[PDB]
Structures are given as structure tokens and as C-alpha cells.
Amino acid sequence: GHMEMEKEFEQIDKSGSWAAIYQDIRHEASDFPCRVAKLPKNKNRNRYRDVSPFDHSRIKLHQEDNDYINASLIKMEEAQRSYILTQGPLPNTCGHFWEMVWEQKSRGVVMLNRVMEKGSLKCAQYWPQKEEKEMIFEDTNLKLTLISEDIKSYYTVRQLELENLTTQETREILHFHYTTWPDFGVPESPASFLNFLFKVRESGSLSPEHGPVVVHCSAGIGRSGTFCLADTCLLLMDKRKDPSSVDIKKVLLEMRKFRMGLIQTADQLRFSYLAVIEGAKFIMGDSSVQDQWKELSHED
């Protein structure tokens, strides 16, 4: 057979029109107000002047003081999966970030960037790197401990313990850290990307019994958007067991109702197609393809 998205992909490649297709998505994308993000008191809570959560979908912190964090709830109604997309936390918003994880009952955090990229700090060091050096976030009364980590060639999975120091309740948070995805770039292959995505899936972190997974890169729109678009499209395909009922551009436009700028280049859009098309093999019952991805990704 041949999926409709596969036929579309070939036509676009052939005519060399990924830029045009992508720019049309940008032109059609939703425009909603971000008035809270732009308040003077929130200036230092934003990593990028021009990347803001819409008011209607922003995550509110549960604190009468200042409830603002640069984070958006991407609620995919048809797919029945939610994601929280957020910027890489700043030195002064790491407490807020873990506060959000707590209040939203997230089980998993997906990090698609490195702390330093291109000679610059794209994300604060918001988790402990050594077991014996735990982090206390005094402003939000949270304690964070590294429990263990499994380092692979291009991604790292960490077990963290998050403790609400007010109630002494503790939770296991899983950290899935993709370390080789360049900003404004694409993963090395669909295989490496899907191997990682399926690692996130297998952990149970995307279960509806949990809060939304937290997904971030530096701005929380480029690589983050790519990750979520692929996952949602595979999920939609999965629910219906029908790949040809999935309209990737339409899904992306729906996601952009909840946060601006999701997917930052034409090639990331192109890569999203590649990931979904390849991932469809597993969804539709080629169970052995997951091992192929593992081998091809060279995680060892």
C-alpha cells in the first residue's frame, strides 16, 4: 500500500516546495493575545522577547504572588492527549518550572536541547547532576534529587525524586534528555527520533492517568513542536488504525492554536512527515521495526 501522507510527501519533495508549504502554515497560524507574558513584572521570566504563551492556554502557577510561567497547555481534543510546552527554564524560574511539574502532576519531562548550544546558555541547569548534590528550590519549597541515570550515545534517561517540602509528599519524575538535536535542526534520522519517542512512550509518562508530559527545548517551540506533532499524529493514526485519516498540516495548525511558532523550519516540518510515515509501520502492526530503530540509532 501507500499512505496518503506518503503520496503528499513525494509530491512536495518532487516540486521542491517545503518552504512554501511551511510558510503557508505560518501565515494561517492562530494569533491570540499574550498580554500577561508582556507585563513588565514578567519581563525576566521570558527567555525570548518574541516567544510568549497565549493567555488562553498559558499554565498558571498556583501562587497568589505571580502566577506566570512561559508555558502552554497543548490540549489535543481529538487525539485525547495533552502536552505542556515550555521554554528552557531561566536561573530565576527553575523553582517555577518544578512547581508547574508538581501542580500539573506531570510524570515525565522531555528535554530536546543541551544547556549550552552554540557557545550560549539556552537552558539553566535545572536538575542535579550528582546524587549527593540535591537541589532545594526555596522560592517554591521543593526538593529535587537525582536518583539514577541511564546514559546512551545520544540521549539520557534520568530518575528524579521531586519532594513538596510543605507536605513531604514525594514523586518520581522521569527526565528524557535528547542531547544531539541541534537548534533549528533535525534529528540524525527518523530512527533515532522514533527510538527516543518510543522510550518516552514506554515509560508510561504519556498516560492520561498522569498530568501532561512537560516538553521543552530552548524556546519550547521548534524541536518541542516537532516532538509533539509526531507523537500526536502517530496517536491519531493509532486510535483509528487508519493512517490516511491523519492530516499532518491540519494537526500542526491545531497545535498552533495553543502555542505560537510550533515547528521552526521547513526541514523540521519535512522531518515530522518522515517520522510519522516511518512510525506508521509500528502502529499498523510491524512490531519488529522498533528493534530496527534501536539498532539504527546506535544508542550504544
Ligand SMILES: CNc1ccc(-c2ccc(C)c(N3CC(=O)NS3(=O)=O)c2)cc1
Ligand atoms: C518568533 N520568533 C522567534 C522564533 C524562534 C526563536 C528561537 C531562538 C532560539 C532557539 C534555540 C529556538 N529554537 C529552534 C529549535 O529548533 N528549537 S527552539 O529552542 O525552539 C528558537 C526566537 C524567536
Ligand SMILES: [Cl-]
Ligand atoms: Cl546539557
Ligand SMILES: [Cl-]
Ligand atoms: Cl557550544
Ligand SMILES: [Cl-]
Ligand atoms: Cl539560562
Ligand SMILES: [Mg+2]
Ligand atoms: Mg557520583
